[PDB]
Amino acid sequence: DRIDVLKGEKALKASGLVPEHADAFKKIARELNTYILFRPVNKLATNLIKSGVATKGLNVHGKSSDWGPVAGYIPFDQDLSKKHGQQLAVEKGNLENKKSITEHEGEIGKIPLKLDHLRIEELKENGIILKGKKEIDNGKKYYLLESNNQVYEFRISDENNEVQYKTKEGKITVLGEKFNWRNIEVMAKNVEGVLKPLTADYDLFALAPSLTEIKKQIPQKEWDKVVNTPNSLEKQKGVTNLLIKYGIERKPDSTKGTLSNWQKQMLDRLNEAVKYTGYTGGDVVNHGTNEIFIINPEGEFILTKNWEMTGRFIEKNITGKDYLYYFNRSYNKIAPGNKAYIEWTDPITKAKINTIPTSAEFIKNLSSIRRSSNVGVYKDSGDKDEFAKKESVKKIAGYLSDYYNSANHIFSQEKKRKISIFRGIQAYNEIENVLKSKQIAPEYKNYFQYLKERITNQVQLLLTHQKSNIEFKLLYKQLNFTENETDNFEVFQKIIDE
Numbered sequence: 492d493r494i495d496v497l498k499g500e501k502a503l504k505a506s507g508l509v510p511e512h513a514d515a516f517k518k519i520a521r522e523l524n525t526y527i528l529f530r531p532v533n534k535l536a537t538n539l540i541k542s543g544v545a546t547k548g549l550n551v552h553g554k555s556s557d558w559g560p561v562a563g564y565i566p567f568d569q570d571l572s573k574k575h576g577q578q579l580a581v582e583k584g585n586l587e588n589k590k591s592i593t594e595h596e597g598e599i600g601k602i603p604l605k606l607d608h609l610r611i612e613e614l615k616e617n618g619i620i621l622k623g624k625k626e627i628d629n630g631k632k633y634y635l636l637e638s639n640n641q642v643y644e645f646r647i648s649d650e651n652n653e654v655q656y657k658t659k660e661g662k663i664t665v666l667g668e669k670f671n672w673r674n675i676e677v678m679a680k681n682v683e684g685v686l687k688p689l690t691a692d693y694d695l696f697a698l699a700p701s702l703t704e705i706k707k708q709i710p711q712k713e714w715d716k717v718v719n720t721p722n723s724l725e726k727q728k729g730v731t732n733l734l735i736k737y738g739i740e741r742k743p744d745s746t747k748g749t750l751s752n753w754q755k756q757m758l759d760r761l762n763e764a765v766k767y768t769g770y771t772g773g774d775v776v777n778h779g780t781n782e783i784f785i786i787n788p789e790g791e792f793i794l795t796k797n798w799e800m801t802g803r804f805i806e807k808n809i810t811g812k813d814y815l816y817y818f819n820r821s822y823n824k825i826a827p828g829n830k831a832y833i834e835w836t837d838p839i840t841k842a843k844i845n846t847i848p849t850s851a852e853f854i855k856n857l858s859s860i861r862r863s864s865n866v867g868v869y870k871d872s873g874d875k876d877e878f879a880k881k882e883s884v885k886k887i888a889g890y891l892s893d894y895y896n897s898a899n900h901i902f903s904q905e906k907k908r909k910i911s912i913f914r915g916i917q918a919y920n921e922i923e924n925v926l927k928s929k930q931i932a933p934e935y936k937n938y939f940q941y942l943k944e945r946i947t948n949q950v951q952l953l954l955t956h957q958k959s960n961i962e963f964k965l966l967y968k969q970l971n972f973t974e975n976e977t978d979n980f981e982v983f984q985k986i987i988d989e
């Protein structure tokens with residue numbers, strides 16, 4: 492799990508959050524016994540945010556800029572964002588910015604970018620732009636601004652800090668355009684009749700509260716009456732109903748993007764803590780859901796370098812220590828040694844995967860196959876057994892997610908690993924049965940063989956991680972040395988041959 496992660500001040504610098512904000516979060520995590528995870532913030536947006544600039548909310552999906560004079564802000568023209576020249580990307584962004592203005596009837600607009608005094612300085616402190624030799628045009632007083640832009644040229648003005656821009660001599664934008672000097676406009680919010688510029692916001696990746704702490708707050712009588720009973724080990728639906736009842740876990744059928752009542756109070760707490768530190772731009776956190784910034788229940792800072800590392804960190808320190816977290820995205824629980832993990836290629840996206848899919852990924856994968864081959868999982872037309880067939884695929888999707896999540900509501904840490912392995916085995920079994928009906932189309936057959944192999948591989952590495960001599964023992968316990976050598980050798984030979 493701790494695969495070369497960063498921590499302390501180095502983790503804080505890589506995350507982009509403003510130092511005083513992260514520090515106030517540290518207290519929340521500690522007062523509430525919760526893990527707080529954030530996506531990394533655009534590092535060129537940190538100063539803007541600490542200086543009070545407002546953050547973008549739900550209504551603006553335009554990417555902020557990482558380069559040029561506009562760096563940190565959200566350019567109306569997305570060819571000035573972290574998307575240097577991706578045709579498809581820039582076109583999607585520009586559209587979103589236009590719609591942001593039309594759909595919010597005045598609450599969102601665009602205003603000319605004004606690089607004040609201190610900002611130009613800050614840009615100069617970094618490798619972004621430098622001031623320079625003045626320029627004259629239409630009786631206007633200018634100052635070009637040097638930026639490694641391949642395709643654009645910029646410049647500022649004197650009285651008004653307005654910043655302008657034009658295409659290079661014979662260069663074309665990625666949309667097939669070119670033009671003369673136009674002011675640079677950025678996305679804005681209508682505060683009290685006045686449009687204020689917007690910058691990057693703090694993206695919550697997750698909030699993982701303590702399950703044991705939660706249990707302690709629930710009336711003892713009710714808990715023992717909803718938990719301690721008939722469900723033998725696995726299948727704790729009771730735990731789930733209590734978490735929903737007391738506003739800890741979101742409603743049954745998660746609306747488009749609803750937040751649990753505990754999550755809403757947590758947002759208020761975070762935003763309130765940031766205001767208390769002098770922030771005057773409103774809220775810094777606006778919704779709750781490849782490096783990840785982590786603040787643990789002890790106020791420590793950690794930063795994971797990629798998704799596999801953060802998936803393993805969550806399993807070991809958060810989920811494995813009884814904090815709450817649900818995986819929607821998959822990862823390999825045990826990392827690759829010499830023999831790389833086999834891969835599957837999505838027919839449509841052409842993406843490659845080497846993990847056991849979670850439920851939603853499984854549903855998507857099957858969707859790619861359905862598109863690409865134009866047939867469903869089964870072949871018998873005039874559906875008969877149409878009920879079990881559908882149920883069958885549903886059971887597999889359920890077990891794939893259980894492999895990653897059944898241990899979320901299980902208290903015993905040693906039971907967590909045991910239930911997870913067993914879930915993987917149930918998935919394998921269900922998949923094999925689907926293949927044993929012999930009524931599966933061929934493009935799906937290949938994908939199911941891939942699932943069988945990855946499952947087999949991971950379940951073998953998990954068992955061994957616990958008991959390194961378990962392979963030997965599973966076979967050894969089945970042998971009998973009270974018999975004579977020859978008889979005992981036949982038994983051995985049957986077991987490994989079957």
Ligand code: NI
Pocket residue numbers: 547548692694
């Ligand atoms: Ni956001």
